[PDB]
Structure formats: C-alpha cells, structure tokens
C-alpha cells in the first residue's frame, strides 16, 4: 500500500491467521505491541468488532467443534 483510508481491512486478514494459525502463536501477542493493532485492547470500537467477530465465526466454521 501507501496510504488512505483503511476500513476493518487488516482485521479481516489477521483473524484468518490466528484461525488457520498460519501465524505463530508469539506473532499474535506481539500484534498487541503494534500501534496498528491498537483497538485489540478497546472494546467499543469497530476494528475490534471484527477480530472477536470475524473470529467466533471462522472458529466455528472450519475445525471440527461439537
């Protein structure tokens, strides 16, 4: 990229990684450490509504669950 806007874009690709875990488990506490992953600690904002959203549905759909 190089700059502009950014709507709930980064989200919906990192979730995907800690779900296909794709990442390693250290990358996603370091995630918190960077400023663009700064929602994860709020709540009451969209950008975080995704990785716990985007999140309980691709953990749910995929893997075997019940």
């Given at each position: 990229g190089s700059s502009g806007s950014s709507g709930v874009g980064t989200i919906d690709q990192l979730v995907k990684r800690v779900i296909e875990g794709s990442?390693?488990?250290?990358e996603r506490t370091l995630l918190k450490e960077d400023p663009a992953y700064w929602?994860?600690?709020?709540?009451?904002s969209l950008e975080y509504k995704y990785y716990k959203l985007k999140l309980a549905e691709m953990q749910r759909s995929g893997p075997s669950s019940g």
């Open positions: 990442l390693s488990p250290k929602f994860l600690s709020d709540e009451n």
